[PDB]
Symmetry: C3
């Protein structure tokens, strides 16, 4: 009269939830790439923005032997303040990412053991 | 002496976990929009960056009947290399998104069936 | 002959799944910061882009007592259309975030109660 069949359905339900959780992890990685990808496009713009500073006045002198060049900075590059903070952000994801993989590994081992014990009850 | 009540609590717990998983899916969609939204702002800037290239020298000639115009490219537009790669990124999310919805549908059907069988045991 | 030990493994498995779900929430917050962080870099560029509009022609007049200044807008700033829509986006995350925390709190209370009842069965 034991509800072993009910447990078989419940054990299967947990396995399905674990799979969806794993799918979220892969989807999260794709979203992270988009953020990093945007930075790459931004860096290209920074090189072009510096060029705009170089553009100042062409032929602005036809009665003098001099050229006015004013390459005033344009793109504010982050060397330590924003760059250092970004590294901290990436490191936090790494620690959380490692913990998630560890729990998933333990869940998989425990999930298989629960199904294994269930089979012995009604093998 | 069967622990049917305990199972009722366990079955309910799985339902709550499924709901949170669904909430993460909707939250993920909001984050994806932010990434796409940033690109839209960037495209507007690209149109303005091209205009800066047009700006070169105004009135830089009052003793000549000519104007120096130097519209050197400014924003590097991605037509195939980055655009094609981005499409691959969106497609991967679609495949994972479809799989997540499929598992959720199966989980909902299985979740209701588990509760249904439980009611028959003590209906 | 009750499978209380099997239930102990199943109850533990749900607890592990809850922890991974919580890890995803913290990871999601880190991803949200990256999107907001990119906007901050963009705002800095907008101030520099306005400066490029100021750059027009230096010394483009050595036979006239006038200077041609053309500060044509460069960065299109969003005051109500995009800004208002962004607020709606943040609000949606808040509602979903609150619901996720509420379910997690209820799951934790229910999770502990399920383990507590299990101990009484075999305390």
């Amino acid at each position: 009269a034991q509800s072993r069949t009910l447990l078989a359905g419940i054990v299967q339900q947990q396995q399905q939830l674990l799979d969806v959780v794993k799918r979220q992890q892969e989807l999260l990685r794709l979203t992270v790439w988009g953020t990093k990808n945007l930075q790459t496009r931004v860096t290209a713009i920074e090189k072009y923005l510096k060029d705009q500073a170089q553009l100042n006045a062409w032929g602005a002198a036809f009665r003098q032997v001099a050229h006015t060049t004013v390459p005033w900075p344009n793109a504010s590059l982050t060397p330590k303040w924003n760059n250092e903070t970004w590294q901290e952000w990436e490191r936090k994801v790494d620690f959380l990412e490692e913990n998630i993989t560890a729990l998933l590994e333990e869940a998989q081992i425990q999930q298989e053991k629960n199904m294994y014990e269930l089979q012995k009850l009604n093998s």
